[PDB]
Structure 1
């Protein structure tokens, strides 16, 4: 059940003015593509806060990657879901190497040692740890299932996408299929949908391994197969995982929100 929004004062949406004339802002299956200029964050914050939304943010930090956790968490504190309930889950082989990072109110961190989500959070966001937040990443992303446009491929034709191309792999996508090339480094959704996805990818990877084949881009290849056959209900623009060193700051990006660390 959803309670009413309060009175709010904001600019009227303009039916005869496009949000953007330079980019696609809705997919052919009517999922929004999230770019700066498309959303009013005050409206969305109200909607999600009224639901007391809790967001889980999951990161793996194994071996040398524990080195990335301090900048990742400190910047998440500044930029990720500020105002909302956040639960970070850090999966690591080195629990004692996790940095002591000061968290805002309503935000918590669990360290899980590696060799429940359903009761604790509403959405799960799964990201690589060698990254840092530089600008707002908020409730605009939340939806049952989302993927993010890979920054090297957002302007490419589908034939250039580096999908798995061998028919022998569960991850196979032929040259005449494919909407986008999604990044393995940043996807999420409701807990139920993320667990569906990871279960499907895990089963497909086991089949591939039993068959002697490893997809060309591993988890990312399988994510792209899944999102081909189960269309995401939002797609994030490359604002959401950019690489400024590799790719600069092109005019189509009004904000650089979350970026690879060198």
Structure 2
């Protein structure tokens, strides 16, 4: 049950005025594509706070990648779901190397010790019971990253993927999908909506568990058949999201590499960005 929004004073949306004329802001299956200028964050914050929404964030920091945690977590505290309940789940082989990061109120961090290709999907799909009990949404991201600007409840939806920053302007035949028919991740040259990057996806706990289970099972089939998809779990993620359309798509604001790609006009904000490695 959703209680009523309070009175709010904000600019009227005008039907004959779009703000964004330069980009596609809805998919052909009527999923919003999230760009700056498409959402009033005050309305969304109200909606999600009224539901006492809890967001889980999973991040893997294995071997040398524990070095990325301090900046990742400190910038998450500045930019990720501020004002909402957040539970970070840090998966690592070195619990003692997790930096001591000071968290805002309503935010928690759990260190989960693990003993590459298949680990993340397998692990997320097994934390199944814990996540269902503790959070409403799960967000699954790479650690070799920093938050530079707002990443908030505008992303939340049953299932989302993020447009890969190298391919948002590309034709589908150029997408680096797995192209060998012997792989479960196979996508022919005449199929595909978008190329989603494996570094940022999420959704409701149920839908994320469905996605990660499916990708894990498909990767195991490939392993049994002696084939490894060209971009590993990302290839499988792409196959899944082709066959199970996401209910929102994040624009490349949400996954950017400024060193590699600069700051194009179409990006009004660079929110979550690659750290050089």
For the criterion TM > 0.5, the same-fold answer is: yes
- Cα deviation, residue 136, structure 1: 0.2
| Cα deviation digits, residues 194-231 of structure 1 (max 9, x gap) | 00000000000010010011000000000000000000
Supply the distance in 2 between the matched residues of 1:200 and 1:220 (Cα, whole angstroms): 13
Matched residue SS, 1:103? coil
Supply the distance in 2 between the matched residues of 1:11 and 1:248 (Cα, whole angstroms): 32
Supply the distance in 1 between the matched residues of 2:112 and 2:223 (Cα, whole angstroms): 27
Supply the distance in 2 between the matched residues of 1:173 and 1:228 (Cα, whole angstroms): 9
CA RMSD of aligned residues (A): 0.3
| Cα deviation digits, residues 88-130 of structure 1 (max 9, x gap) | 0000000000000000000000000001100000000000000
Residue aligning to 1:55: 55
Matched residue SS, 2:88? strand
Supply the distance in 2 between the matched residues of 1:63 and 1:204 (Cα, whole angstroms): 26
- Cα deviation, residue 34, structure 1: 0.0
Matched residue SS, 1:183? coil
1:215-230 map, 5 Å: 215-230=229-244
Matched residue SS, 2:229? coil
Matched residue SS, 1:15? coil
Matched residue SS, 1:206? helix
Supply the distance in 2 between the matched residues of 1:18 and 1:157 (Cα, whole angstroms): 26
| Cα deviation digits, residues 7-37 of structure 1 (max 9, x gap) | 0000000100113111000000000000000
1:76-225 map, 5 Å: 76-115=76-115, 116-225=130-239
Matched residue SS, 2:71? helix
Matched residue SS, 1:6? coil
Supply the distance in 1 between the matched residues of 2:206 and 2:14 (Cα, whole angstroms): 36
Matched residue SS, 2:172? coil
Supply the distance in 2 between the matched residues of 1:217 and 1:163 (Cα, whole angstroms): 8
Residue aligning to 2:34: 34
Supply the distance in 2 between the matched residues of 1:212 and 1:250 (Cα, whole angstroms): 41
- Cα deviation, residue 175, structure 1: 0.2
| Cα deviation digits, residues 167-213 of structure 1 (max 9, x gap) | 00000000000000000000000000000000000000010010011
Gaps of 5+ in 2: 116-129
Supply the distance in 2 between the matched residues of 1:179 and 1:76 (Cα, whole angstroms): 30
Supply the distance in 2 between the matched residues of 1:42 and 1:192 (Cα, whole angstroms): 27
| Segment of structure 1 superposing worse, 18-27 or 223-232 | 18-27
Residue aligning to 2:249: 235
Supply the distance in 2 between the matched residues of 1:128 and 1:221 (Cα, whole angstroms): 16
Supply the distance in 2 between the matched residues of 1:15 and 1:49 (Cα, whole angstroms): 27
Supply the distance in 2 between the matched residues of 1:69 and 1:93 (Cα, whole angstroms): 13
Supply the distance in 1 between the matched residues of 2:225 and 2:72 (Cα, whole angstroms): 37
Supply the distance in 2 between the matched residues of 1:198 and 1:84 (Cα, whole angstroms): 25
TM-score (norm 1): 1.00
The count of residues paired between Structure 1 and Structure 2 equals: 262
**Off by >4 Å, runs of 4+ in structure 1:** none
